[model samples]
Target: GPLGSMPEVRFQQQLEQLNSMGFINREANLQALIATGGDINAAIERLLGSQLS
Candidate 1:
């Protein structure tokens, strides 16, 4: 099994991944993340889809 990590690391990693997409506005990414209940992949999908307001 994979070793566990702290939630903060996970969250920061998600934010960095979002940034790697290269077009996600900082605010938009944060909001989309919240809206998706911290589901970063879904947030990224929403982000690329231009679904975040």
Candidate 2:
């Protein structure tokens, strides 16, 4: 859904998936996911890009 708020179930599901993929920083993952409007690929890119800085 919207960037500001996702359904709790979907947000948790995505959070779990990201954690499984080794994006273990829950707060950062949440920020990236929300900022990307729940686009996992975009979130990954954001995470990786941040790591490079």
Candidate 3:
């Protein structure tokens, strides 16, 4: 897994939340979530900021 040896449940909830908000790119979403350490607000900011580049 690209997420390495961690549990899926860790990010699953956040992933679903992001998906619900129309952030369908699982790869980028996962990257954002991981980058923010599961902080949804920061993940959202990261995702939105990434789009600018």
Using TM-score, give the best candidate's number: 3
Worst 10-residue lDDT window for candidate 3 reads 1-10
Q: In model 2, how large is the Cα lDDT of residue 27? A: 84
What lDDT tens digits, residue by residue, belong to model 1 across residues 1-53? 65433443555567778878784476777667766767898888877787536
Minimal lDDT window, size 10, model 1:
2-11
lDDT of 2: 0.75
lDDT of 1: 0.69
Model 2 Cα lDDT, one tens digit per residue, 1-53? 45544444555577788888898888878778777767877777888887754
Best by lDDT: 3
lDDT score at residue 41, model 1, on the 0-100 scale: 83
Off by over 4 Å in 2: 1-7
Model 1 residue 15 CA deviation in Å: 1.6
Off by over 4 Å in 1: 1-12, 51-53
- Order candidates by TM-score, high to low: 3, 2, 1
lDDT per residue for candidate 3 within 17-45, as digits (tens), equals 99998998888787887877778788888
